[PDB]
Amino acid sequence: RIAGFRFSLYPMTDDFISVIKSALAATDTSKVWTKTDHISTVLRGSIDHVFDAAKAIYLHAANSEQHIVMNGTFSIGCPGDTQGDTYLSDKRVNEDAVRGLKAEAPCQFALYPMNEPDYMGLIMEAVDIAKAQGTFVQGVHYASELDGDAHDVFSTLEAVFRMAEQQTNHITMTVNLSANSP
Amino acid sequence: RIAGFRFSLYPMTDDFISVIKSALAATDTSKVWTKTDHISTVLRGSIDHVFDAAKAIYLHAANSEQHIVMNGTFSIGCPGDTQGDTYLKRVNEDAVRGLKAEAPCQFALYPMNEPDYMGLIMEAVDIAKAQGTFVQGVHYASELDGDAHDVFSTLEAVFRMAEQQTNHITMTVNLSANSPSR
Numbered sequence: 001r002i003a004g005f006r007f008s009l010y011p012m013t014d015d016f017i018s019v020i021k022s023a024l025a026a027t028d029t030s031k032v033w034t035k036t037d038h039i040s041t042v043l044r045g046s047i048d049h050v051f052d053a054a055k056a057i058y059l060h061a062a063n064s065e066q067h068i069v070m071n072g073t074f075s076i077g078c079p080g081d082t083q084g085d086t087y088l089s090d091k092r093v094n095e096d097a098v099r100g101l102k103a104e105a106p107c108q109f110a111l112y113p114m115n116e117p118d119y120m121g122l123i124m125e126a127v128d129i130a131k132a133q134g135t136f137v138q139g140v141h142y143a144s145e146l147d148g149d150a151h152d153v154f155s156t157l158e159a160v161f162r163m164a165e166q167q168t169n170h171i172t173m174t175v176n177l178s179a180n181s182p
Numbered sequence: 183r184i185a186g187f188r189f190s191l192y193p194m195t196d197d198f199i200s201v202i203k204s205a206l207a208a209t210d211t212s213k214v215w216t217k218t219d220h221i222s223t224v225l226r227g228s229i230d231h232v233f234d235a236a237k238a239i240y241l242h243a244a245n246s247e248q249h250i251v252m253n254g255t256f257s258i259g260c261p262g263d264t265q266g267d268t269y270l271k272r273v274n275e276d277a278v279r280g281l282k283a284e285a286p287c288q289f290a291l292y293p294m295n296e297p298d299y300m301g302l303i304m305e306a307v308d309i310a311k312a313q314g315t316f317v318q319g320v321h322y323a324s325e326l327d328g329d330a331h332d333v334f335s336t337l338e339a340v341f342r343m344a345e346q347q348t349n350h351i352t353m354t355v356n357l358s359a360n361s362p363s364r
């Protein structure tokens with residue numbers, strides 16, 4: 001039960017290389033297995049650590065002040081899946097370093113519960129949590145819109161993710177998060 | 183059954199608004215319904231029309247000569263799919279005969295509510311192999327490489343197959359043009 005996040009940062013600026021490089025290096029990534037490549041970075045580990053590093057990387061990137069987007073896919077429970085491209089063993093190591101950092105996280109996201117006859121209800125559940133949390137804006141074709149500070153939106157995304165995986169063995173969730181837009 | 187592609191363009195440049203605008207306006211978008219928002223664009227129509235328009239957007243954006251990413255989700259066969267928001271022939275093929283771009287790609291296919299989904303994902307890697315676009319498998323995705331013509335040919339091929347064998351599929355894609363690491 002290793003959580004995964006494959007994501008990309010997109011700094012809308014000539015200074016893109018440094019923003020990417022710097023968001024990654026600024027994060028405490030000691031609690032996740034990481035691999036950066038030409039297209040994307042992948043984090044693997046426990047849900048806490050994956051989500052913790054995800055929010056962190058997002059907040060560092062956003063605090064560059066450039067218009068940045070984080071776009072990626074959260075995954076857990078894929079059948080097979082090596083027991084070891086991971087860091088094993090509970091603390092949200094990034095929490096402290098980033099509680100003075102804030103950011104807007106307008107977001108479009110999609111929940112994909114796999115091999116799951118009740119996936120429609122699971123997604124319906126996902127919408128309810130977002131509504132309950134106050135982060136939900138609207139539904140659009142193929143996704144749901146969220147808005148709020150990084151902390152509230154990332155809360156919403158994790159709660160949805162946690163809810164659904166409690167129910168189904170294999171789930172993916174895509175997120176598309178925008179910071180520092182006009 | 184109506185195909186959809188919800189995607190974003192990420193120009194890693196200061197000139198990005200103008201890059202996004204240009205790529206959408208340069209394309210012949212008359213055979214797909216479209217809606218652009220502060221985060222993403224959705225195209226809805228037939229499979230030929232969705233992929234035809236998607237490829238032409240990619241080509242136009244790449245030919246800005248700037249590092250640009252197209253990142254998005256193809257979707258067909260959604261149970262609660264509305265009948266509106268669609269256009270009722272690959273209209274761009276001519277216009278883009280002259281265009282070329284590299285299209286290195288990480289994609290991932292999600293057959294929904296499908297017990298044999300891993301077999302379908304097996305199949306998809308094989309198509310990429312059959313067409314010579316497959317590079318390797320990575321955690322949570324597969325890597326293609328080639329020119330836009332073959333990479334986009336592969337994706338639609340993968341998408342068509344899956345959509346024939348099961349009812350609701352999603353496919354994410356992350357395509358990178360003009361990277362300075364190349």
Ligand SMILES: Cc1ncc(C[n+]2csc(CCO)c2C)c(N)n1
Pocket residue numbers: 007008009010016017018020021036037038039040041363
């Ligand atoms: C999270 C994250 N990982 C990798 C890339 C891809 N990428 C693009 S430019 C570049 C080089 C910067 O030194 C890299 C690694 C990305 N966009 N986002």
Ligand SMILES: Cc1ncc(C[n+]2csc(CCO)c2C)c(N)n1
Pocket residue numbers: 109110111112119120123126127139141142143144260261262
């Ligand atoms: C958070 C969330 N919002 C919307 C969708 C969109 N969506 C995709 S398939 C589907 C119908 C369920 O049978 C719906 C509503 C999603 N997946 N996840």
Ligand SMILES: Cc1ncc(C[n+]2csc(CCO)c2C)c(N)n1
Pocket residue numbers: 189190191192198199200202203218219220221222223
């Ligand atoms: C395909 C595409 N659709 C929308 C956006 C989002 N977006 C970001 S800045 C902007 C204003 C440009 O006129 C828009 C629409 C995108 N990045 N890519």
Ligand SMILES: Cc1ncc(C[n+]2csc(CCO)c2C)c(N)n1
Pocket residue numbers: 078079080289290291292299300303306307319321322323324
């Ligand atoms: C096109 C395609 N390539 C690779 C994966 C990745 N992947 C995800 S789970 C899994 C094992 C089978 O369930 C594999 C290979 C994908 N999803 N879609």
Ligand SMILES: [Ca+2]
Pocket residue numbers: 206207208209210211
């Ligand atoms: Ca046009």
